[PDB]
Amino acid sequence: MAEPLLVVGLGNPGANYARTRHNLGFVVADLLAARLGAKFKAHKRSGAEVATGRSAGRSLVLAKPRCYMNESGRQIGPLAKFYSVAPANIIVIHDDLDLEFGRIRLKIGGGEGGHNGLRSVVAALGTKDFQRVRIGIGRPPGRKDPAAFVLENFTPAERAEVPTICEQAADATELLIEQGMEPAQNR
């Protein structure tokens, strides 16, 4: 445990995409960097922007991809390699379709819940054995393309709670870092 962590947050760049459902990992990652006094440095070498920090005594590397959601992995693969982090020491924060709105679960491995970003990372890291901070966004309402549901902005009802759900998410991420899946605790 003289080894560093990678905390990746999944999202699409662009002002109009910032507050969409598929951009929760970005906000949650933006929150953490802020908590650790970390500044996002453009990482030419892999493509994503990167902030470094320290939490519970552990080396942290935070990352947010600078391309579209679909090629996260083409930027997180070379980035993880750069800072030589094993896939088990990589935590990825993303919105989950299979989790009810507001629910935050923590898991290593498992599915990909139709998230095109998580798959892109699984492909680029080969294995699907990295950690996840899953943020429920709920299932789409009735007849509705999920791939467009996640590119829409949260309803005025929901967005009232998003700020508080992300704070709780950043808190789950911190707690995952100090313990393990001894967390998934009251998280």
Known catalytic residue: 22? yes
90-96 vs 5-9, strand pairing mode: parallel
Marked catalytic residue, from 22, 43, 94, 115: 22
R_g of the chain computed on alpha carbons: 15
Residues just before a chain gap in the chain (C–N exceeding 2.5 Å) are: none
5-9 vs 58-64, strand pairing mode: parallel
* All structural domains of the chain with their residue ranges: 1-187
CATH architecture of the domain with range 1-187: 3-Layer(aba) Sandwich (3.40)
Closest by CA to 166, choosing from 27, 46, 5, 58, is 27
The most distant pair of C-alpha atoms in the chain lies apart, rounded to whole Å, by 50
**96 with 112: CB under 8 angstroms?**
no
**10 with 72: CB under 8 angstroms?**
yes
- Binding-site residue numbers are 17, 68, 70, 116
* Other beta carbons less than 10 A from residue 148's beta carbon: 9
Report the structure determination method. X-ray
Kindly list the strands in the beta sheet with 58-64, ordered across the sheet, starting from the edge strand earlier in the chain: 41-42, 49-55, 58-64, 5-9, 90-96, 131-136, 104-108
Write the burial class of residue 183 (CB in 10 Å: 0-12 exposed, 13-18 middle, 19+ buried): middle
